[PDB]
């Protein structure tokens, strides 16, 4: 059994976003929209239900742990259900939660050499936290092969490179490296059950689709309905391109997901401006129709 807990299902900013009065966030606050509040994207993985691997540490971490009881097993006066943290990139929305866990150090943190460089220079979390009882103990994710985190010996992680997209603050923002962004294949080696996790997905090539065909559950970027969704809502001028493949239209994730009728399909990392958030929207209805689920905070998935 592989347990996947959705701690946060929204894109950067969360839903509603603090400074946003777009149709979704305003409507949420007005009480006129049927929608559920979401914290920033983050999952936790277990092979036993007791020992948990956190995938990304969002700014909303404190409320996310609070809302998931197994994160506090209460086996000592100071205790946590978090046994390791895996980072897929060095973005602020995926790493900032580590500061909120400093009274719990040491932590085993898994990340690539490139992420580790960002996090010892431009956003020096490792250097800052070394001053709290030994800080973060780095475990290198190599860009080929697999890794096993000993707290969950039955989960085998196979990371796959996604393109570029280093954060604004990174000394190598203009100089993209393999290692900057990862998706994960996670396998329960007891059952052969496989999760394909790609919350940040710009492009789907040949290798990608073949991996996806091997998986039983596809947990994939659901950031924007349309490439220009920010401009349509009036809240910015950046496009999906940002490195997110929008749901709709040619080469979009729904067209891609059509090739995958057997797999469980879940959209996660959903922008505050995405119409799929509105429970009554035609876009939400189109997702239900194609057999695709919209992640929510507190969603529990059981794989095989």
Residue 77 token pair: 């006066």
Rule CB under 5 A: which of 89-108 touch Cl ion?
91-92
Residue 61 near which of Zn ion, Cl ion, none (CB within 5-8 Å, type-dependent) = none
Rule CB under 5 A: which of 164-203 touch Cl ion?
167
User: In angstroms, how far is the first alpha carbon of the chain from the final one?
Assistant: 6
**Residue 252 within binding range of Cl ion, rule CB under 5 A:** no
**Residue 256 within binding range of Zn ion, rule CB under 5 A:** no
Residues 6+ apart with CB under 8 A from 24: 15, 16, 33, 35, 233, 272, 273, 274, 275, 277, 278
**Residue 59 within binding range of Cl ion, rule CB under 5 A:** no
Task: Report, in Å, the least distance between residue 199 CB and Cl ion.
Answer: 14
- Cα–Cα nearest to 271, from 41, 87, 49: 41
| Region of 49-57, 84-92, 128-136, 272-280 interacting with Zn ion (CB under 5 A) | 272-280
CB closer to Zn ion, 22 vs 129: 22
Q: Which helix (H) or strand (E) holds 235?
A: none
Task: Report, in Å, the least distance between residue 290 CB and Zn ion.
Answer: 25
Binding residues with Zn ion: total (CB under 5 A): 5
Residue 91 near which of Cl ion, Zn ion, none (CB within 5-8 Å, type-dependent) = Cl ion
Contact criterion met (CB below 8 Å) for 195 and 185: yes
**Residue 152 within binding range of Zn ion, rule CB under 5 A:** no
Task: Report, in Å, the least distance between residue 56 CB and Cl ion.
Answer: 12
Residues 6+ apart with CB under 8 A from 285: none
> What is the rounded distance in angstroms from the CA atom of residue 20 to the CA atom of residue 23?
9
Q: Name the pairing type of β-strands 292-294 and 300-303.
A: unpaired
Among 2, 10, 25, 85, binds Zn ion (CB under 5 A): 25
Among 5, 80, 272, 281, binds Zn ion (CB under 5 A): 272
Contact criterion met (CB below 8 Å) for 59 and 87: no
241-262: string of b/e by CB count within 10 Å (b at 16+)? ebbbbbbbeeebbbebbeebee
**Residue 224 within binding range of Zn ion, rule CB under 5 A:** no
Among 6, 22, 109, 114, binds Zn ion (CB under 5 A): 22
Give the binding site for Zn ion (CB under 5 A).
17, 20, 22, 25, 272
Give the binding site for Cl ion (CB under 5 A).
19, 91-92, 167
């Amino acid at each position: 059994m592989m347990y996947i807990q959705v701690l946060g299902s929204a894109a950067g900013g969360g839903f509603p976003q603090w400074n946003c009065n777009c149709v979704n966030c305003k409507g949420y606050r007005d009480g006129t929209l049927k929608a559920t509040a979401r914290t920033q994207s983050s999952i936790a993985l277990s092979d036993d239900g007791v020992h948990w691997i956190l995938c990304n540490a969002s700014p909303d971490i404190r409320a996310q742990l609070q809302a998931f009881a197994p994160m506090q097993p209460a086996r000592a006066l100071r205790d946590t259900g978090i046994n390791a943290i895996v980072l897929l990139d060095s973005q602020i929305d995926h790493t900032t939660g580590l500061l909120s866990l400093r009274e719990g150090c040491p932590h085993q943190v898994w990340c690539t050499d490139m992420v580790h460089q960002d996090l010892t220079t431009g956003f020096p979390l490792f250097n800052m936290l070394s001053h709290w009882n030994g800080g973060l103990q780095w475990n290198r994710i190599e860009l080929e092969g697999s890794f096993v985190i000993d707290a969950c010996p039955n989960l085998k992680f196979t990371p796959f490179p996604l393109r570029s997209a280093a954060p604004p603050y990174s000394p190598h923002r203009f100089d993209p490296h393999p290692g900057d962004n990862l998706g994960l294949m996670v396998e329960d080696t007891r059952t052969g059950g496989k999760l394909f996790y790609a919350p940040g997905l710009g492009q789907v090539d040949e290798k990608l689709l073949a991996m996806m065909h091997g998986a039983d559950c596809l947990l994939v970027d659901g950031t924007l309905w349309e490439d220009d969704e920010m401009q349509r809502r009036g809240v910015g001028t950046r496009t999906g391109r940002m490195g997110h493949l929008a749901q709709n239209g040619p080469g979009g994730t729904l067209e891609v997901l059509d090739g995958f009728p057997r797999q469980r399909k879940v959209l996660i990392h959903i922008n505050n401006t995405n119409p799929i958030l509105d429970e009554n929207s035609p876009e939400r209805a189109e997702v239900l129709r194609r057999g695709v689920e919209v992640a929510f905070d507190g969603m529990s998935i059981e794989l095989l």
